[PDB]
Amino acid sequence: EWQENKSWNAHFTEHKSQGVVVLWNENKQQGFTNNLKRANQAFLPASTFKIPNSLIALDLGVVKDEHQVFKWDGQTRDIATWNRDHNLITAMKYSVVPVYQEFARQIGEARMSKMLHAFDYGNEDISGNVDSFWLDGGIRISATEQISFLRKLYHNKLHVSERSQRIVKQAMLTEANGDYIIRAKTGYSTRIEPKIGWWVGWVELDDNVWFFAMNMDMPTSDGLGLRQAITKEVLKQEKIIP
Ligand SMILES: CC(=O)OCc1cccc(-c2cccc(C(=O)O)c2)c1
Ligand SMILES: [Cl-]
């Protein structure tokens, strides 16, 4: 069911880094990774948590739809794209933490915890502050657990409405051309060691879907572009994308 392909380690060592890529071939129900142990090691989800957070906020009515505007609070932060109004689409695209912190406050601890259990999401543990637990609280998830969750989302099998899942999958749209569609979400965890980057999502082809989840050590923000670049080199090597 899971097979290790250590040839992919070259894509990490080429960049003097370390990490794991996990792929899942949906038609064949077969998984692949360069590192079985790290594929099952759990880390802070950081901004990959915007996927479950979006789903919960929509299903509870905290977010009406993907057009509702969440006004900038006027506090200047160091990420320029955060100092502006957002909707769900752009808040996902620019990983706008303060928007999702307000979602979380309105969801509240009780509803957040029971929905993460309903989702079977990671260790289902929201200990810490309700508006930051995915950045520095007790929640943890592994790359293989991200795949499990994403497959449910793809198939509309999570315990929220079909509408909520369709909207979040729209908001995950990252790249599309004549050859493939990628729906995905980045993450960057810095508040507890080891600092890591995430990229989780899937690749839609004409006649198959490949789910993926990767994380990698990220000692500085200068390497963030490697999250997508390394994943895409693996996809290219496996002839999943040109
Ligand atoms: C985790 C942490 O220290 O968050 C603070 C911080 C520092 C540097 C960059 C970013 C950031 C902002 C927007 C998008 C992305 C991305 O990679 O999509 C990254 C966030
Ligand atoms: Cl779409």
Give the number of C-alpha atoms closer than 13 A to the C-alpha of residue 90, restricted to the C-beta side. 13
Exp. method: X-ray
How far apart, in whole angstroms, are the C-alpha atoms of residue 197 and residue 18? Answer: 11
Six token digits for residue 140: 């943890």
First and final C-alpha spacing in the chain: 26
- Residues surrounding ion ligand 2 at CB below 5 Å: 170, 173
Find out whether the beta carbon of 93 lies less than 6 Å from any atom of ligand 1. Answer: no
How far apart, in whole angstroms, are the C-alpha atoms of residue 198 and residue 155? Answer: 22
Burial of 218 (0-12, 13-18, 19+ CB in 10 A): buried
Query: Could you tell which of 221, 227, 228, 231 is best to mutate to test the pocket of ligand 1, judged by most ligand atoms within 8 Å of the CB?
Result: 221
Find out whether the beta carbon of 90 lies less than 6 Å from any atom of ligand 1. Answer: no
Burial of 139 (0-12, 13-18, 19+ CB in 10 A): buried
How far apart, in whole angstroms, are the C-alpha atoms of residue 49 and residue 34? Answer: 24
State which CATH number among 3.30.365.10, 3.40.710.10, 3.40.50.300, 3.40.190.10 fits the domain covering 1-242: 3.40.710.10
From 210, 204, 200, 201, select the one nearest 181 (Cα to Cα): 204
Q: Would you list the domain boundaries of the chain?
A: 1-242
Ligand nearest to the CA of 175: 2
- Is residue 73 a contact partner of residue 219, using CB atoms and an 8 Å limit? no
Resolution (A): 1.9
Cα 187 to chain centroid distance, Å, stands at 6
Helices (H), ranges, 50-142: 50-60, 88-93, 97-107, 109-118, 133-136
Find out whether the beta carbon of 34 lies less than 6 Å from any atom of ligand 1. Answer: no
Find out whether the beta carbon of 48 lies less than 6 Å from any atom of ligand 1. Answer: no
* Residue 95 assigned ligand-binding role: yes
**Cβ partners under 8 Å of residue 201, min gap 6:** 150, 172, 174, 182, 183, 184, 185, 211, 212, 213
Tell me, in angstroms, the distance from the centre of ligand 2 to residue 207's CA.
Answer: 17
How far apart, in whole angstroms, are the C-alpha atoms of residue 65 and residue 47? Answer: 20
**Cβ partners under 8 Å of residue 128, min gap 6:** 136, 137, 138, 139
Residues in the chain: 242
| DSSP summary character for residue 78 | S
Task: Name the one residue in this structure whose structure tokens are 């890529």.
Answer: 21
